[PDB]
Amino acid sequence: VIQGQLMSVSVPVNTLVVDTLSPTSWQASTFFVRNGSNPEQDPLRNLSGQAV
Amino acid sequence: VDWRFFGRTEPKEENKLWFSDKITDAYNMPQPTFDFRFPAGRTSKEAEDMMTDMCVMSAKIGGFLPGSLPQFMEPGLVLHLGGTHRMGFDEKEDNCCVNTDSRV
Amino acid sequence: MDIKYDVVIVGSGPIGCTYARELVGAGYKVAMFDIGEIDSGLKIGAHKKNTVEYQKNIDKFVNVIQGQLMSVSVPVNTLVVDTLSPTSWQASTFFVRNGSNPEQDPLRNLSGQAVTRVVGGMSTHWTCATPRFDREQRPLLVKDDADADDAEWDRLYTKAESYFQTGTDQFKESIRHNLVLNKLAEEYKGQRDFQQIPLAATRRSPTFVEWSSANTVFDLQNRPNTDAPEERFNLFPAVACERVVRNALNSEIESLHIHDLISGDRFEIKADVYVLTAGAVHNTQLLVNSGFGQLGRPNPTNPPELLPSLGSYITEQSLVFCQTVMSTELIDSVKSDMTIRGTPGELTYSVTYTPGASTNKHPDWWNEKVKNHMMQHQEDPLPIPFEDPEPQVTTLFQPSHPWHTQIHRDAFSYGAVQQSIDSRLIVDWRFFGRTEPKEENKLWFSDKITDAYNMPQPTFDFRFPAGRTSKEAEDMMTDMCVMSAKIGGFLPGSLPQFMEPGLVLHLGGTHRMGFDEKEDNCCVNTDSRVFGFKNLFLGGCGNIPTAYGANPTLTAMSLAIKSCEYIKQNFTPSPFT
Amino acid sequence: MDIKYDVVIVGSGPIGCTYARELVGAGYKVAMFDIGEIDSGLKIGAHKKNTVEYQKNIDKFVNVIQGQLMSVSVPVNTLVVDTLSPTSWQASTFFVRNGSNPEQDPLRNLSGQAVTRVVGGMSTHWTCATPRFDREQRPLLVKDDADADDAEWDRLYTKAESYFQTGTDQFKESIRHNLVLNKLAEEYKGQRDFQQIPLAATRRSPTFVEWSSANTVFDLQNRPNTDAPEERFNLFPAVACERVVRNALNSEIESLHIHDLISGDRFEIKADVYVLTAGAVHNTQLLVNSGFGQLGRPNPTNPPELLPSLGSYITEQSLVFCQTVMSTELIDSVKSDMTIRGTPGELTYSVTYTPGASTNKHPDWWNEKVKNHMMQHQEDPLPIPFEDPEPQVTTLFQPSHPWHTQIHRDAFSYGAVQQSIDSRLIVDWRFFGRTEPKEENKLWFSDKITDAYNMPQPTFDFRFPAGRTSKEAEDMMTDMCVMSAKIGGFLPGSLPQFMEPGLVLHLGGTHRMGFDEKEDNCCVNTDSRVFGFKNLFLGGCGNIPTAYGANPTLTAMSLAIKSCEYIKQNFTPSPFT
Ligand SMILES: *Cc1cc2c(cc1C)nc1c(=O)[nH]c(=O)nc-1n2C[C@H](O)[C@H](O)[C@H](O)COP(=O)(O)OP(=O)(O)OC[C@H]1O[C@@H](n2cnc3c(N)ncnc32)[C@H](O)[C@@H]1O
Ligand SMILES: *Cc1cc2c(cc1C)nc1c(=O)[nH]c(=O)nc-1n2C[C@H](O)[C@H](O)[C@H](O)COP(=O)(O)OP(=O)(O)OC[C@H]1O[C@@H](n2cnc3c(N)ncnc32)[C@H](O)[C@@H]1O
C-alpha cells in the first residue's frame, strides 16, 4: 500500500545495458530520455529514494 | 525486530532543490531536480558513528537477520526533507523564506 | 633460449599445435611461444576435464571455464551506488576504473567475448564439438570447380579429424542420448536428420571420456627426446610476443619481438617462417601493434598502407539457449519393454524383459541397464541409470534451418536453484546462427589505452546486421522453442534467451582469407599467407571469411593443414645440428 | 607400483609433504598416495595462483577455488518448483537426488564444509596465512611446565615456518597496507598491536608473489634423481586409499588397501609405517572404514571397541565478513605531503614534494610513488598507484579480543554488482572465532549411503555450543563493526554477516590429540601415534583438540614435525639396494 502511493520525485536517465535483446528487436543507439526520466538530474547528487 | 537510526544533516547552501525550465512532470509542472550530497564534517562523522551505535546496541538483543544486514538506505527514502522553504527571524541574516508566523 | 629457428609459432592452442605437428614432423627446427603457462598436469596442454574428480563432479567444471575467461573489452561502469556511508571516498564522475575500456561504446560491444592465456589455449576447457561446414558456410579453396573444392575440403577435414580424434560413436550406449535422438528423428521424419555431435574425444570406460585438446594434436614435449630423437621443438611458456618486425619493402618479416614475463627482459627472435596463432583477437592485436592495418579509432580519411581489411567484417554467431525437463511420455518410454509385477520395495517385486525380441523398441544393452537400475534401486522413481552418459545430439545446418544445433549437457552453465530437479531430466539446447560479414563490424585497437600486458586495448564496434542475419536469429529462437517442446518443457531459471554477444566465443573474420586482397577484401590467401609477405602466416578462426553457424575450430585446423603443405614446399629445414 | 615400502603416506597435502620431507631426507623408502591428480604445472603440488595471468587478474582465482571445493554433506533439497510445464516429469516426493545425503539434518550441518582432491591438496589454492597459536589456543605438549611447553612449541614452529617459507615483510612497501596498518595502530595505541599477517610466500618482484604450497615443503619429484641420488620417494596420484588392516591384537597395522582409479584394480600395500594425512574429514572416513570408532548413526548403547572419541569433539570456527570503502579522510592523507600547481591534463601541471622534510607525514618512497602516479595518470582522481599491492593486516588473537583477524584482499569472494567501486578503495575483513569442543558435535559416516568414491558418506551433527562460543561470536561481530568503521563504511553487497558454517574450512578435532586416551577423550598421543598401534600416525588439523581462532595449518605442521621425530627414533630405514 505504501509503495503504491510513493511516486519518485526525480529519476535519472537509465544507463543499464541490455544486450540480450533479439537482433530483431528495436534497439536504441543512445541512452535517451525515457520512462519519465529527468535528464536534468546528476545521478550521483540525487535523493533517489525521495518520493511524494 | 526492526532497527532504524536517523541522523541529522547540517543545512548547506549548496544542497538544493531546483525546478527545470524545460522538462515537466506528469502534471505539466516544472520538474524537480535535486543537487544534494551529505555534507562533509559533522554530518558525515555523526552518520558513521550512528551506524556503529546501531551495530553495538542491536547485538544486545540478537544477531542480524540474513537479508536485512546493517546498511544505509537510499538518500531520501527516509522522506524527512526539510529546509526547502525555511523559517528564520530575518530574511537576509538567517537565509530564509518565512518568519516565525510562517509568513512569506 | 636459442637465437635462430626454422619456424617460430606464436601461441600453443590447437591451431598452433597443428602447425607444430606438421612442421616438427617434417624436420623443421621449431620454437613455440605462449604468453600463458603450463597448467593442466604432466600432459602439456591437455583437457582439464580429463580428471577422475571432474568426471565425477561435472557441475564444478564451469568454475574452471570461468577462471580462464578474461573479458576482452569492458565498458566504463555507470551503475549507481548510493548506499555508501557518507564517510566513504566517492568520486563525482564515472571515471575509468577496474580495467574498463573508455573507448568502448557499451551498446555496440561483444561484451561476452573473452580470451584464455594458458598452454593449450581454449582447448584445455572446450566442448570438443567438431562439425564440418557444408558448402554454404565454407570459403572456396578452388575457384569455379565445386567438385574439386569438395574433394579438397574432404581431404583436409579427414586429416584434421584424425589429429583431433573426432568420432561419432562415443555416446552410442547412452540411454538419454538415444532417447532424445530417437524422439527427434521420429518427430522430423522426412524433414531433418539427427545424429551425434561429432566430438573430438575417445571413450575409455563407460564412465570416463578422454576429451581431446591441443595435447592430442601435438604432445608439446621438448624434442629431441627418447621417442623422437630426430625432431627439434622447444616450447617457451610465459613469453608475450609483442610484434613481428617488417622489412622496409613490406615483403618479409625480419624478427619477432618477445617479452619474457618471468625475467622481465625482451628479445629479437629470428626464423625463416613466422606463424601467428594467438586467437582471432590476439592475432589482430599483434599485427596492428606491428604496423599492419590502422591503430586507433577507425577513420576512412586516412586509409592504412597495409591490410586495409584487418579487423573489418568480423563475425560472431548469435546464440540462443535454454534447458528442458524431460516429458512424462519420454520417461515412461524408457521402460516400455519391461514387464513389471508388484510394488517397488516389496519382496515380490519383479522387472523383466525378453532379450532379442522382435517387438522390443529398445536394444538389449538399454533394457539390461534399465532392469538393473530398477531392481537395485527401488527407492528411486526414475528408470534412467545414475551413471548414464549425457545426450550429445545435433541436427546440422541446412538451407531450411540455417543454424547449428546442440542438444546436450555442457560443462558451462551449471547453476543451483533449479538443482531441485533431478539431473537425469535435464537437457541443454544451444542454437547458433550465422552472421553476414559487414565492413562496419570492426575490432580495433586503442592508441592510448593498454591492456594488462601493455598492449593496444581491443575495442569492438559490432551490431548484428539487419536483413537475413537478424531474421534468421528470430526464426532460430522460434525453432528452438518448437523443437524443445517435443522433448519437454523449459526448466525454470533457464528459459529461452539470447546469450550476451560474443559469449559463444566463435569470433571469425578478424584477418580473413580470400583469393585476392582487393576483390575479396581480405588479409591472407588460401595458403593462409599474409598478402605481400613471403614468410608470414596466420592460423585460426580469424581466417574464416564466410557466415557460419557450426563450431569453427575443425575448419580452422583444416586451413592450417593446407598452410603447412605450402610451408613444406617453399622452405628448407636446416640440417640437424 | 611396487612391493614393500618403509613408509606409506596417504595424501599429498602440506601435512603429507611435511612427513615426506622429514622421512625421505632421513633415508626411508617412502611412497605417497593421493586420490587426486597432478594439477599445477611442472612444479608438482604448487600454488595455482603462481601464474602471471592470475596475478594480473586476481578477480578470476575465486573460480579456481570454487572449482575444486566439493561439498562434504548436502541435505535433501526441498525447494519447490511449481512452474514446470504440466508435460514435464515431476516426482511426488522430495526424493534423494543429485548427490544429496539423506542422513543429513539440514539444521545441524556444516553446509560450507568442502574437500579438495588434487595433488598438493588445499595448499594449491589457500590464502597462506600462517600465524602461531598462543598458549590459550594450543594443546599442551608438556604437562605442568609452561616454559618447557613454550620452548618445545617455539622449536617446532620455527622449523615449520622455515618449510613453509613464512615471513612478515612481503607487503612492507604497499601504500594501502601501510595506510590501513598505521591508522589502526593509531586508533588502538596501547590497547591492541597490529602487524602484517604472517604469510607463507616469497616476493619475486614488485608485481609477483610466489605463494607457498605443498611443493614448497617437498617438491614431490620421484627420487632417486640427479639432485637427490640417495633418496627414495614415489608419488602415486589417482589412487583412492580405502582401508588400513588391523592385526588380530589391535596393536599394529598389517597393510593398506588401495584402489587405482585409472586401471580400476585394487591392491594390498605393505610398509613398516603408515601415515594418514588425508584431511580432517577423510582421515576419519578412512579410519571408520577400517574398524576404528563406530560406523553409522551414533548410539551410546553399543560403544565402539576402538578409539571411541573418533569423530566427536569436532570444532569449526565462526567466521564474520564484510568489505569497506576507504574513507575520504584516509584517501586525502595519502597525498598530504604534495604541493599541486596548475590543472591536471595540462603540460603546466606540477606535483611536487620535499624529500626529507621533517613536516612530511610519509617516507620518501611513499611520496615518490604518489607523485609519479599523479603525474603519469592525470585523468585519475585517486592518489594510490594502480599496481599498489593489497593490504595484509592483522591484530593477533588475545584474551581481551579472542578472535583472529585478517584485514586484507582475498582471492575468494569476487562479485559483479559492486565492481562499480574502484578496487583501490576496497578492503576485506574476516574475523574467526574459536569453538569449544563438545562431545555432541560430531562427524559420522553412513552405514548405507556412499560417496562418489563408494566410501561411507560423511554426515555432520554440529551446532555452535551455547555459552562462551556463542557470546564470543557475537562480541566478535561487534568488534569488526567497531574496528572497520575506522577505515571506511561497508561496501553495499558486502555487509557484515556470518558465513555458512564450515566455509572457513578449519575443521579440527576429528581425531584429536591428548596425553591419555580415556582422560583426555582423544585418538592420538603427542607423537600423533594412534593409541594401541605401534605404526599408525595421523597428521592434520584433526589432531588439534583445543578451541582455536587462528589459521591452523602451521600448528598441524608443527605436530607432524614432532611426530617424525618419534618415527626416526623407532623405525630403521631399509638399506639402499
Ligand atoms: C572456452 C570455450 C571454447 C570453445 C567451446 C567451449 C568453451 C567453454 N566449445 C567449442 C566447441 O564445442 N567446438 C569448437 O570448435 N570450439 C569450441 N570452443 C572454442 C575453441 O576452443 C576455439 O575456437 C579454439 O580453441 C581456438 O584455437 P586457437 O589455437 O586458434 O586459439 P586459442 O585456443 O585461443 O589459443 C591461442 C594461444 O595464444 C596464446 N597467446 C595469445 N596471445 C599471445 C601473445 N601475444 N604471445 C604469445 N602467446 C599468445 C594464448 O595464451 C593461447 O594459448
Ligand atoms: C580452500 C582454502 C583453504 C585454506 C585457506 C583458503 C582456502 C581458499 N586459507 C588458509 C590459510 O590462510 N591458513 C591456513 O592455515 N589454512 C588455510 N586453508 C586451509 C588449508 O589449506 C588446509 O588446512 C591444509 O591444506 C590442510 O592440510 P592437509 O595436508 O592436512 O589436508 P589437505 O590440504 O586437504 O590434503 C589432503 C589430501 O589427501 C587426499 N585424499 C583425501 N582422501 C584420500 C584417500 N581416501 N586416499 C588418498 N588420498 C586422499 C586429497 O586428495 C588431498 O590432496
PDB file of N, CA and C in Angstrom, chain C residues 176-212:
ATOM      1  N   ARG C 176      19.887 -41.722 -22.369  1.00  0.00           N
ATOM      2  CA  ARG C 176      19.388 -40.367 -22.549  1.00  0.00           C
ATOM      3  C   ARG C 176      19.667 -39.842 -23.961  1.00  0.00           C
ATOM      4  N   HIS C 177      20.878 -40.100 -24.437  1.00  0.00           N
ATOM      5  CA  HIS C 177      21.258 -39.696 -25.770  1.00  0.00           C
ATOM      6  C   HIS C 177      20.328 -40.265 -26.837  1.00  0.00           C
ATOM      7  N   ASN C 178      20.163 -41.589 -26.835  1.00  0.00           N
ATOM      8  CA  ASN C 178      19.369 -42.282 -27.846  1.00  0.00           C
ATOM      9  C   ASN C 178      17.877 -41.984 -27.673  1.00  0.00           C
ATOM     10  N   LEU C 179      17.466 -41.746 -26.431  1.00  0.00           N
ATOM     11  CA  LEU C 179      16.086 -41.359 -26.141  1.00  0.00           C
ATOM     12  C   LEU C 179      15.740 -40.071 -26.871  1.00  0.00           C
ATOM     13  N   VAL C 180      16.544 -39.046 -26.657  1.00  0.00           N
ATOM     14  CA  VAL C 180      16.299 -37.745 -27.253  1.00  0.00           C
ATOM     15  C   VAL C 180      16.451 -37.770 -28.773  1.00  0.00           C
ATOM     16  N   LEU C 181      17.530 -38.400 -29.229  1.00  0.00           N
ATOM     17  CA  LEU C 181      17.834 -38.507 -30.653  1.00  0.00           C
ATOM     18  C   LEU C 181      16.732 -39.255 -31.389  1.00  0.00           C
ATOM     19  N   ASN C 182      16.348 -40.422 -30.872  1.00  0.00           N
ATOM     20  CA  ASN C 182      15.262 -41.205 -31.462  1.00  0.00           C
ATOM     21  C   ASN C 182      13.940 -40.421 -31.532  1.00  0.00           C
ATOM     22  N   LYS C 183      13.583 -39.712 -30.470  1.00  0.00           N
ATOM     23  CA  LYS C 183      12.345 -38.927 -30.475  1.00  0.00           C
ATOM     24  C   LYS C 183      12.367 -37.853 -31.576  1.00  0.00           C
ATOM     25  N   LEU C 184      13.467 -37.114 -31.643  1.00  0.00           N
ATOM     26  CA  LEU C 184      13.596 -36.013 -32.602  1.00  0.00           C
ATOM     27  C   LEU C 184      13.663 -36.492 -34.043  1.00  0.00           C
ATOM     28  N   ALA C 185      14.378 -37.589 -34.269  1.00  0.00           N
ATOM     29  CA  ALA C 185      14.365 -38.274 -35.572  1.00  0.00           C
ATOM     30  C   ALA C 185      12.935 -38.647 -36.016  1.00  0.00           C
ATOM     31  N   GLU C 186      12.130 -39.135 -35.081  1.00  0.00           N
ATOM     32  CA  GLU C 186      10.738 -39.527 -35.372  1.00  0.00           C
ATOM     33  C   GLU C 186       9.891 -38.306 -35.680  1.00  0.00           C
ATOM     34  N   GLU C 187      10.002 -37.287 -34.837  1.00  0.00           N
ATOM     35  CA  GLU C 187       9.220 -36.066 -34.977  1.00  0.00           C
ATOM     36  C   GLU C 187       9.498 -35.314 -36.273  1.00  0.00           C
ATOM     37  N   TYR C 188      10.691 -35.490 -36.822  1.00  0.00           N
ATOM     38  CA  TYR C 188      11.055 -34.787 -38.033  1.00  0.00           C
ATOM     39  C   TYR C 188      11.320 -35.747 -39.192  1.00  0.00           C
ATOM     40  N   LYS C 189      10.841 -36.981 -39.034  1.00  0.00           N
ATOM     41  CA  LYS C 189      10.805 -37.986 -40.098  1.00  0.00           C
ATOM     42  C   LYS C 189      10.534 -37.324 -41.447  1.00  0.00           C
ATOM     43  N   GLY C 190      11.483 -37.474 -42.369  1.00  0.00           N
ATOM     44  CA  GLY C 190      11.388 -36.894 -43.706  1.00  0.00           C
ATOM     45  C   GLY C 190      11.622 -35.387 -43.833  1.00  0.00           C
ATOM     46  N   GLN C 191      12.147 -34.737 -42.788  1.00  0.00           N
ATOM     47  CA  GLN C 191      12.320 -33.284 -42.800  1.00  0.00           C
ATOM     48  C   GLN C 191      13.714 -32.858 -42.343  1.00  0.00           C
ATOM     49  N   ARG C 192      14.221 -33.506 -41.296  1.00  0.00           N
ATOM     50  CA  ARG C 192      15.524 -33.186 -40.742  1.00  0.00           C
ATOM     51  C   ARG C 192      16.194 -34.469 -40.302  1.00  0.00           C
ATOM     52  N   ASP C 193      17.518 -34.522 -40.451  1.00  0.00           N
ATOM     53  CA  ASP C 193      18.340 -35.628 -39.964  1.00  0.00           C
ATOM     54  C   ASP C 193      19.004 -35.250 -38.645  1.00  0.00           C
ATOM     55  N   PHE C 194      19.033 -36.212 -37.727  1.00  0.00           N
ATOM     56  CA  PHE C 194      19.678 -36.067 -36.436  1.00  0.00           C
ATOM     57  C   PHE C 194      20.789 -37.100 -36.272  1.00  0.00           C
ATOM     58  N   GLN C 195      21.828 -36.731 -35.543  1.00  0.00           N
ATOM     59  CA  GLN C 195      22.948 -37.621 -35.326  1.00  0.00           C
ATOM     60  C   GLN C 195      23.634 -37.153 -34.054  1.00  0.00           C
ATOM     61  N   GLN C 196      24.649 -37.883 -33.632  1.00  0.00           N
ATOM     62  CA  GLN C 196      25.542 -37.417 -32.580  1.00  0.00           C
ATOM     63  C   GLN C 196      26.379 -36.238 -33.073  1.00  0.00           C
ATOM     64  N   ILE C 197      26.545 -35.226 -32.218  1.00  0.00           N
ATOM     65  CA  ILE C 197      27.548 -34.197 -32.438  1.00  0.00           C
ATOM     66  C   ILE C 197      28.915 -34.904 -32.655  1.00  0.00           C
ATOM     67  N   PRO C 198      29.610 -34.606 -33.755  1.00  0.00           N
ATOM     68  CA  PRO C 198      30.979 -35.103 -33.937  1.00  0.00           C
ATOM     69  C   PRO C 198      31.782 -34.522 -32.809  1.00  0.00           C
ATOM     70  N   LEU C 199      32.341 -35.383 -31.971  1.00  0.00           N
ATOM     71  CA  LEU C 199      33.122 -34.933 -30.819  1.00  0.00           C
ATOM     72  C   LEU C 199      34.592 -35.370 -30.920  1.00  0.00           C
ATOM     73  N   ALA C 200      35.502 -34.455 -30.603  1.00  0.00           N
ATOM     74  CA  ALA C 200      36.920 -34.776 -30.511  1.00  0.00           C
ATOM     75  C   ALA C 200      37.173 -35.361 -29.127  1.00  0.00           C
ATOM     76  N   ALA C 201      37.124 -36.688 -29.053  1.00  0.00           N
ATOM     77  CA  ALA C 201      37.077 -37.408 -27.781  1.00  0.00           C
ATOM     78  C   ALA C 201      37.176 -38.905 -28.012  1.00  0.00           C
ATOM     79  N   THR C 202      37.680 -39.613 -27.003  1.00  0.00           N
ATOM     80  CA  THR C 202      37.760 -41.070 -27.027  1.00  0.00           C
ATOM     81  C   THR C 202      37.232 -41.589 -25.727  1.00  0.00           C
ATOM     82  N   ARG C 203      36.314 -42.556 -25.811  1.00  0.00           N
ATOM     83  CA  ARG C 203      35.817 -43.217 -24.614  1.00  0.00           C
ATOM     84  C   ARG C 203      36.851 -44.186 -24.042  1.00  0.00           C
ATOM     85  N   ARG C 204      37.060 -44.146 -22.725  1.00  0.00           N
ATOM     86  CA  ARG C 204      37.981 -45.094 -22.088  1.00  0.00           C
ATOM     87  C   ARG C 204      37.273 -46.168 -21.280  1.00  0.00           C
ATOM     88  N   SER C 205      36.107 -45.825 -20.758  1.00  0.00           N
ATOM     89  CA  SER C 205      35.312 -46.742 -19.973  1.00  0.00           C
ATOM     90  C   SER C 205      33.902 -46.183 -20.025  1.00  0.00           C
ATOM     91  N   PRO C 206      32.912 -46.939 -19.554  1.00  0.00           N
ATOM     92  CA  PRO C 206      31.534 -46.434 -19.550  1.00  0.00           C
ATOM     93  C   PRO C 206      31.373 -45.164 -18.702  1.00  0.00           C
ATOM     94  N   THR C 207      32.350 -44.820 -17.847  1.00  0.00           N
ATOM     95  CA  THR C 207      32.205 -43.604 -17.021  1.00  0.00           C
ATOM     96  C   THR C 207      33.272 -42.539 -17.262  1.00  0.00           C
ATOM     97  N   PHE C 208      34.164 -42.787 -18.223  1.00  0.00           N
ATOM     98  CA  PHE C 208      35.268 -41.871 -18.474  1.00  0.00           C
ATOM     99  C   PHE C 208      35.521 -41.652 -19.944  1.00  0.00           C
ATOM    100  N   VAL C 209      35.544 -40.383 -20.329  1.00  0.00           N
ATOM    101  CA  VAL C 209      35.846 -39.986 -21.696  1.00  0.00           C
ATOM    102  C   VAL C 209      37.078 -39.106 -21.690  1.00  0.00           C
ATOM    103  N   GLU C 210      38.053 -39.445 -22.534  1.00  0.00           N
ATOM    104  CA  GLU C 210      39.243 -38.612 -22.707  1.00  0.00           C
ATOM    105  C   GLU C 210      38.972 -37.597 -23.805  1.00  0.00           C
ATOM    106  N   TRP C 211      38.708 -36.366 -23.389  1.00  0.00           N
ATOM    107  CA  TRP C 211      38.375 -35.287 -24.290  1.00  0.00           C
ATOM    108  C   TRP C 211      39.634 -34.761 -24.945  1.00  0.00           C
ATOM    109  N   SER C 212      39.558 -34.469 -26.246  1.00  0.00           N
ATOM    110  CA  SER C 212      40.730 -34.016 -26.988  1.00  0.00           C
ATOM    111  C   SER C 212      41.052 -32.569 -26.707  1.00  0.00           C
TER     112      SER C 212
END
